[PDB]
Structures are given as structure tokens and as C-alpha cells.
Write a protein that binds this ligand. Sequence first.
Ligand SMILES: [Zn+2]
Length: 500
Amino acid sequence: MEKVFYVTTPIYYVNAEPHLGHAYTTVVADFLARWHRLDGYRTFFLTGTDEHGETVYRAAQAAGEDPKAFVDRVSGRFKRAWDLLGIAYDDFIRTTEERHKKVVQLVLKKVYEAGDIYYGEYEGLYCVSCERFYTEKELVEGLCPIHGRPVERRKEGNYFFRMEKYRPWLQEYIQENPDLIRPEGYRNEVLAMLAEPIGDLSISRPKSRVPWGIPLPWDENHVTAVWFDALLNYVSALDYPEGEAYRTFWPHAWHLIGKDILKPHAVFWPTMLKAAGIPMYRHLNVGGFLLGPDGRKMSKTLGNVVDPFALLEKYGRDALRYYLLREIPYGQDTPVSEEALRTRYEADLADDLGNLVQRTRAMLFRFAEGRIPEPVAGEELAEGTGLAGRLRPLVRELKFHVALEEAMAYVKALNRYINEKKPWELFKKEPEEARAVLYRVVEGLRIASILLTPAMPDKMAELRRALGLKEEVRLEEAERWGLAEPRPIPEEAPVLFPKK
Ligand SMILES: [Zn+2]
């Protein structure tokens, strides 16, 4: 009724091996979802896999497996990847699901009955071996990018969608809705796209050519083009028509994507929505490329590919998540490297945060009978309660890196305070004063740990446990001072961020 958050990631080609790009987009969507859940929002986080098309079908036959059984198996790679990365999604939609088929056909019908679909002839360069058309731009030296052999000009009957009909509306909508396309730079890129005619697009191909997919409701002899099929996942996962999920979350839809698929989301998708009579989404948030160490786009031929699972294996889920969120301004092409993750890990996590927790524990045993002291005013550290309010807008404006920098700045402030006040000296002439300074550091760690939870869920809970603090938290708790209770801390606690 009041606070609702809906975020989606693109559904990935089911047969593609999970890589850094997939990992990044999903981790960002997870941070957003986790953050809004923490801030009291009714949240829905969607992700999934695109499993239709002749390419996957071919792959299945190649492997000598039934197509459905094939996608059931390979989709597991993404599910395992998300499990490994600690992604807490609410739903994992697969385009083979029955509910997806029903929504796609129901939407196709509306658009059909609305007069935006006609039968025409598709002509162009064709590779009979790939059984698909190719634009000169797709050919590699005028040859099939797959078979590396010449292509021929063929014709094929296809049903088409009158997308151009909606260009005028779309151009005006984007012009009137300045914040629709998030990172500013991409809005201009899309406005440039909408400048020229966008024409009509093929929305189907004969089942004889593409046998894997959703049939058109008015012609079971044709299969819905994968582009159209995949995009509707955003509403089919909400059971669009009658689903209460659709009524609840669609009005707050936030789509996260890599710039690679900007056109389909900023141009195709909006016209489909308008044609079907579905409200526009609230925001399209465009991410940039994660470049290799050398600053160039990642590619095997360049040998600058960075494996996210190798990094996760070596440094751990939390270290990787924190690094991707802190080091990369969302939307800005940025180089990534193990060395950068390592430095970030050792500096920010092992030193700044981890060691502070460890020496706080030590000092609590030395000057506080191994427990949290009685609460006292925060004084110079009370400002920590203002961080949540400062970070909210940052997070919502996709400035995750700035949000994390400010949270860590407070952590550095806590370190600075101890070395400044020196409770080990105050204890000499006045222990009570030493216990007051200690309480302030513990309460500060509590607040900071809350703000960082969406980035490092497991490790922040472990930090909380290490200080005997309430483990499950709410962002609102980070806005009040004196909540840490004077209870005993665990006799022993493992090193929060161990050396790697
Ligand atoms: Zn080919």
C-alpha cells in the first residue's frame, strides 16, 4: 500500500556459461532487493533463464538429449551460480513454464486483436546451416559467424509487429520522463535511437524452421520470436492478468540490464507494453562493461577474462560482492582484477573492519569484564545514526559505490576514535570513561554492520554475533543510538575476515 520494491535482472541465455557480467548485474539487483527489504519495503526480486529458440534446441540434439530435459539441466548452472553468490531472489522464472506460455499467448492475442500484427515476407541473407537470417553487420567478412562459409538470400513468411506505430508515443514519453532511463548517458543514446524510424519487427518464424518455443495463438504453425517471448517474463512471473503479484509489483518495476541489451529494453519492450495496454515500467537501470585488467573488454583471445567463481573461491562470497559494489560505479565501464579485489579486501575488510572488531573484542575482555558496557551518549559518533538517511537516496539513484564509501568512512572514523581516545589509557585513572568509549565503538559497529548487510549478508551477521549483538536487523534500527545491549560477548569468535 505504501512501500513496494520490484527489481528484475535480465533472464539469461540458458545454455550460456555464467560469467562476470551475469554475476555483476545479479549482485547489484540483490543489493537493491536486500536494501529495500531491510528498509521495510514489500519486495519482489526476479531473475531467470531464456530457454527457447532453435540454438538451444540444436544444442540439445547435439548433446543427444530431449530439449526440455536439456534446459532443465543447464538452467541449473545459473541457479547454482546464484546460490554460490548468495543471491536471495524471490523467483527464478524459466521461459518453459506453463504460466509464461499463457501470458505470452494472451499478450500476443491482445496485440493481434488490436491490429498491430500482420503477415509479410522476410527477405535477406540466410545461412541454411544455421537456419536463420543474418544482417551484413552480423556476418564475419561476409561469411556466417558460425560456419564461416558464404550465405544466400532467401525469403520466408513471418508475422510482423508494427512497432513503428508506437515510436512517436515512446519518444515523447522518454522526453517527458527524464529519470526513466537511469544512467543519464544512456537516455541520450536511446533518444538518438528513437530519432530514426524503428520499423516493423518479425515476431515469428515457421515451426518448420524454429520448433522450440511458444506457438502464436492464431497460427500454431508459427513460433514466437525469442526476443518478444523473453521480455514478457517481467510480467508473466507476476501472473500478469489476474495475479495479485502483478497488481502489487508492476507499478514499481525497476529493470536492471547491461548496456548490451539497451535497445530491446528501451525501445522494443516499451512498445510491447503500450500495445498490450500495460503500464510502462518505472526505471530502466543500465550497467556498463566490466573490463579486463588491461582496460579492454573481456575476451578469451585477449586473455584478460576474470572468472568470478575463481575469485569467490579464493576470497569468498562477501569479499567479491563488496568489491563489485564498491569498485564499480554502476553504468560506468570499469576494469576489474584479482589484484584490485585483493587490495580492497585486505584494506577495507581485513584491516579497517575486521581488525577493529577483533581488537574491540580484546578490549572488552580487558576493560569490560568481557561484555558490552552500559549505554552512553554517542557524542562525536552519534552522527552514525544519520547514515541510513544519507544512503537511502544514494542507493535509489544507483550510487552504490558512494553509499559503501560513506559507510566505510564511518568505520574509519570508529578506528580513528579509539586510537584518539585510547580506552587503555583512560582505564588507568578512570575505567568508567574507558567503558563509555568502548560502548560507542560497539554501537558504531552495530550501525555500520546494518548498512553493509545488503552487500555482505553472512559476514555482517557473523560480525553481529561476534559482539553478541542482535543478529537479524532492520535499517530503521541503524537510525537510533544506544540500542546495543550490555550483555556478554561470545567467549570465542573466529577471525571475521581471515588472511587469504
Ligand atoms: Zn551458419
